[PDB]
Symmetry: C3
């Protein structure tokens, strides 16, 4: 089935942030048996391998922005690969890698499906521009490069001349927000982006959050869904092996509920499993817990349901 036809892309990249280890994300998710688990779930899985991200020496900063050419090139390559997967009639599954890679993932997906809607599960808005950021880390800026309304606010950053903003502010929904920078809050409010911070999740419950999210994106007509999942969207009690953990996150149950509801639309076309850093666990168990949670989230995106699943055969005969 279309909702279970997948194209795996490994994106072992880390230069979008300063913490080493996030490039081991595709390795550890594969080692956990993700591909085998998806095949056992009646999925047609094709593995496009791990993208080679050739080192860019002398990649000097653009103002305070670190490794711009490396980040720009990695996303450019990913865009080409995601577009190839999409042309082959498969749901692209990007194994990250830092969240800067979403520039390439969404850009590439939009080349084949320009009418796509984005669901962004994260503790963070990742909407800083190369001018608003105080960190210069591009994993906290991918949304600004993708939004049409921010054209003219993004300077000419080396490595990003290939980028054409592909999404409007009305085509993105945030879920799980709880650590937003002043500049990002201003952008979020002035552009009128739809969001469900932890405050709205507490107020409404995840059931109403999903009902509202899917109605807001699909109400007019059915359109492709791109889910960009930052594992720090979930509480650090479930995903501790991550760069920027924030307390009071989405529960394991809420994470599974979001992904079960998206699967059920039959419109998931793109998926990013980002910011898994296996060198950031305090214990080996914290790493396995993060990886196992990220695997469980991924399986729910492709049909694994808590009520159970069965093949279309008579089990009583």
């Amino acid at each position: 089935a279309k909702s279970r036809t997948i194209g795996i892309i490994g994106a072992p990249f880390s230069k979008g942030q300063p913490r080493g280890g996030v490039e081991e994300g595709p390795t550890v998710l594969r080692k956990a048996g993700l591909l085998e688990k998806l095949k056992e779930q009646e999925c047609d899985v094709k593995d496009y391998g791990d993208l080679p991200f050739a080192d860019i020496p002398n990649d000097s900063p653009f103002q305070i922005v670190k490794n711009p050419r490396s980040v720009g090139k990695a996303s450019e390559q990913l865009a080409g690969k995601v577009a190839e997967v999409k042309k082959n009639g498969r749901i692209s599954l990007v194994l990250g890698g830092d969240h800067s890679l979403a520039i390439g993932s969404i850009s590439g997906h939009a080349r084949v499906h320009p009418d796509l809607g984005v669901i962004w599960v994260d503790a963070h808005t990742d909407i800083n521009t190369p001018l608003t950021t105080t960190s210069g880390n591009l994993h906290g800026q991918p949304v600004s490069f993708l939004l049409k309304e921010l054209k003219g606010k993004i300077p000419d950053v080396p490595g990003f001349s290939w980028v054409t903003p592909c999404i409007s502010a009305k085509d993105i929904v945030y879920i799980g927000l709880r650590d937003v920078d002043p500049g990002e809050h201003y952008i979020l409010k002035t552009l009128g982006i739809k969001y469900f911070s932890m405050t709205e999740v507490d107020r409404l419950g995840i059931g109403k959050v999903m009902e509202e999210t899917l109605s807001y994106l699909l109400g007019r007509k059915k359109r492709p869904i791109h889910l960009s999942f930052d594992v720090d969207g979930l509480d650090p009690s479930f995903t501790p092996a991550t760069g920027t953990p924030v307390v009071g996150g989405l529960t394991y149950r809420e994470g599974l509920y979001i992904t079960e509801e998206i699967y059920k639309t039959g419109l998931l076309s793109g998926l990013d499993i980002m910011e898994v850093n296996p060198s950031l666990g305090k214990t080996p168990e914290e790493v396995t817990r993060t990886v196992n949670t990220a695997v469980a989230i991924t399986l729910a995106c492709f049909g694994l349901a808590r009520e159970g699943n069965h093949k279309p055969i008579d089990y009583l005969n």
Copy 2:
């Protein structure tokens, strides 16, 4: 009062599953002061002791089904004891022991009250038949033996000739499901059994879940309630000392909410506290935590309320 008149039955039985220790469940629940705590809560408590489950040697398997005569006999004896407690005008409180004992608990309860409704709190459906089962563990099969709609699907298993299905598919509600076998999911969907998997609990909230459960069972007319509580229905962060723990379970609060709502109907007539295995804690604290949670669940079934409780006297004089 009727809702606080209890008959305690210890059922130290483990042969419905492969892990040793679950037979110590009645011992550890008693040691925690359950009987004394119930009496302090204005309960009339009579202890019927721990059932002697005389060893059945040469109990060869029926196909892949393990210890069928032992499980069949333990349930047959429990049925007789529960029926005796029910005839004495008491709410039967079965301290397990593995969940295979539900065959005897519900069969015995149904002999005195054939119009009973079942609330099944558990991570699992336990509805595998001796033919759909892949483990051959009878604790994953009690429901198949009890359902009228599965008559003709249950083969002649040694030790179970006394069993007559006593409940219809419409007389059972599951709460907490999150680990269902393919065969079980097929049965659950084809028989149209009412269930609230963790997905429905996330969607609706425990308030709506309870409102729907009690309306579905009692809407037509008031009838006796049998609550079969598998401790693995709650999240392993509360009940870790259990045979098959599954992450993303019911919270301590949700567990107390279910039981507070059932007490309030005044219709609880039977209760099973199952799958407490004190040899399965990683630390002694994990065992005490499991036992304390199981005690807390039990006390709420018999009137203990979080808002408080008071005797009908003037406390200001």
Copy 3:
């Protein structure tokens, strides 16, 4: 702004209960950078210092009631100080110290604002009278001294002759109740006090709880709000370093939701952050966790929002 104009009062007092260390509450909250964090959040902060609570030797018990003159005097002093802060047009922020200090905090606040409404966030009602109590610990009795309907039920306790009940039973809302004494439950039911025990929080969800709480207190017309926050209202997994921890408490998210909703009314006039005991952590991390949670709660009372915050300037220019 009025909602961000604060008067800090340290109340290092412990004689309302038997566990030493709660007097270090103002010290540890200050060490965590509470004052500096509030100023960074666009707050006008004035620090009235830590109240000196002169030792009262020969403070004999009134029946079973321990240190009545010490508790009575500490609250009398606090009342005078809170009234001073209120007269200076500031929101009084009392850093405790045990909950008996609420006698002084609310009495002092009511002298300037007699039309105030109280939100009491706690696992406990703290409404025992000097005659209903069984421990004789005054931190479990402050509401009894404050209620107009309990005039004639409170005996002449040494150190409390200055007290005039300032609140009616209809002017208080409890949130988080899960450990209520029989006498307290009788008072709660006979006086018809509005409460949301953990049972109502589970039933309704924190969204509906806040909607109902604010409508019940502000429906007729806008009036000042006094929030009396006992850190044991939150689950011990967030606030373990406290005297009376009770499992199944409010989550970190629910705590932040209550305080975000109160800030939003613009009517918070008084705040108590009570029962932080830094000598009651099992590990230093348990103490830092409790302190960090208490700081996070306080910051939300004065505008810190999970969706983000920004200054009224153009961030894109």
